[PDB]
């Protein structure tokens, strides 16, 4: 075979089955990912993803080197490409791991045709998922689960998750490298930042380092003492935990860096050393297993990120509000719990997860009655794990709009962030502007007695915005609105 392994997710060598069954019997493989570098054409995407994906694919590239091989990056669209690509590098396999999501699964079909019209083999295997979804949902009738609860019972009844697959071996690809010509870089090398055209002037060290070599070492850190005892076995929020950690998973698991089978039996394996003699709950796999619960809802649902026409979304009458999304999108609303989530989120890719409830509550039910789905694509510009399926199913959870959701109250702007972080130094590092504020005051400055406000050196209204709403007021309306809302839902 001449194969080719296309990268999409997947952008690891290690439990990469796909890659396995490229390598088998071929005389060449190519491994490809095909880049669209026409940016004004898509939707807009953040420097931090894009940074991380270029990382990642620097380090497979660099992971191939290794292998004396090379990573192909083609630029272009795949529809598009693909045909060429068939006939000058005479393509006779192609693999790739699945995507559930309903544009990739629409997307691969059309490139299954066009690879069955040119007499070329497909592999697909599904290592993205801890499970396979399609069978998920026929179990439960085929329809997806549209609680957790259901979800976790489907799966009690179904064979544990595949075993991370066997690593491709060194030689095995040394039988099929492909020629690589010496102006390789030129034509399907890694592009830069500077390359692309982003503006880098000042731009330091990512706080989220992409790439497998990366999501390696934090999974063996991340399986230490320290760690686990903290994340696993007693297990507490506190304000340390609001920053970026060493020890995070997330982003490495949206991009394939990391393979979730992977970390779920090495966490399964470190609770056996743990503890003696006992399965463990499912709830040790929370992460991962909420993350799966999203994918299937998402897989058969083409409207999934939308209200109207999604069949799983209650119809509510957001507020058509532009200058609010904007305030709130830009960390200008003058809530600074809310401001410095949104100021910590556009600059480093990620926040914590309850930092994402704060300010999602915040857009939508909570204060500014914003549509879930504006908040969606923001997160899709700015942070560095949120894919189609979790969310959209995040946001869509969070506002009441789908799940089964028995409310339980939105989190208070000031008091939450009060609660988190008492200190107020989260607010300090993300919003030095108000630094002066004292702990009393700084998740509500504009409480603050005068004389504070000049001892702090940032005058209310002058230096950093007054509130953009009245909470009280505002939640109070939404909070009735909301009961309104369900009231009007048919019973049965
Ligand atoms: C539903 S849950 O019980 O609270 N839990 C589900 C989960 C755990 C791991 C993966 O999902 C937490 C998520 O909701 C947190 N989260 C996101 C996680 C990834 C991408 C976007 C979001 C997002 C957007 C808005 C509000 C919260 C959000």
């Known amino acids: 075979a001449s194969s080719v392994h296309w990268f999409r997710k997947g952008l690891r060598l290690h439990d990469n089955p796909a890659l396995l069954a490229a390598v088998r019997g071929a005389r060449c493989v190519r491994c490809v990912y095909i880049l669209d570098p026409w940016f004004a054409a898509s939707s807009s995407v953040g420097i931090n993803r894009w940074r991380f994906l270029l990382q990642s694919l620097e380090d497979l590239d660099t992971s191939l080197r290794k292998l004396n091989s090379r990573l192909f990056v083609v630029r272009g669209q795949p529809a598009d490409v693909f045909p060429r690509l068939f006939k000058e590098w005479g393509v006779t396999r192609l693999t790739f791991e699945y995507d559930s999501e309903p544009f990739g699964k629409e997307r691969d079909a059309a490139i299954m045709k066009m690879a069955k019209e040119a007499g070329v083999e497909v592999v697909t295997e599904n290592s993205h998922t801890l499970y396979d979804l399609d069978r998920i949902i ?176 209650i119809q509510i009458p957001w507020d058509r509000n532009p200058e609010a999304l904007a305030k709130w999108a830009e960390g200008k609303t003058g809530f600074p719990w809310i401001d410095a989530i949104m100021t910590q989120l556009r600059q480093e890719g990620w926040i914590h997860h309850l930092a994402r409830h704060a300010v999602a509550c915040f857009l939508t039910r909570g204060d500014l009655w914003v549509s879930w789905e504006s908040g969606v694509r923001v997160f899709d510009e700015l942070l560095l794990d949120a894919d189609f399926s979790v969310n959209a199913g995040s946001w869509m959870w969070l506002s009441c709009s789908a799940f089964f959701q028995q409310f339980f109250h939105c989190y208070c702007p000031v008091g939450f962030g009060r609660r988190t972080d008492p200190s107020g130094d989260y607010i300090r590092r993300y919003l030095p502007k108000l630094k002066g504020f004292p702990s009393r005051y700084i998740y509500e400055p504009w409480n603050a007695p005068e004389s504070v406000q000049k001892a702090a050196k940032c005058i209310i209204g002058v230096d950093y915005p007054r509130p953009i709403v009245n909470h009280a007021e505002t939640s109070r309306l939404n909070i009735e609105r909301m009961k309104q809302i369900y009231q009007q839902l048919s019973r049965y």
């Open 138 to 313: 026929e179990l439960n009738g085929q329809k997806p689960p549209l609680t957790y609860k259901r979800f976790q019972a489907l799966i009690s009844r179904m064979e544990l998750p595949k075993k991370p697959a066997v690593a491709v071996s060194s030689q095995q690809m040394e039988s099929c490298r492909a020629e690589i010509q010496e102006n390789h870089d030129d034509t399907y090398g890694v592009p830069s930042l500077e390359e692309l055209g982003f503006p880098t002037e000042g731009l330091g060290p990512a706080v989220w380092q992409g790439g497998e070599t990366e999501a390696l070492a934090r999974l063996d850190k991340h399986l230490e003492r320290k760690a686990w005892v903290a994340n696993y076995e007693r297990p507490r929020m506190n304000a340390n935990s609001l920053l970026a950690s060493p020890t995070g998973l997330s982003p490495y698991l949206r991009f394939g860096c990391l393979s979730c089978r992977l970390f779920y039996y090495r966490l399964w394996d470190l609770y056996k050393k743990v503890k003696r003699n006992s399965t463990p709950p499912l709830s040790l796999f929370g992460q991962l297993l909420w993350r799966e619960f999203f994918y299937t809802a998402a897989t058969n649902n083409p409207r999934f990120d939308r209200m109207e026409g999604n069949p799983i979304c």
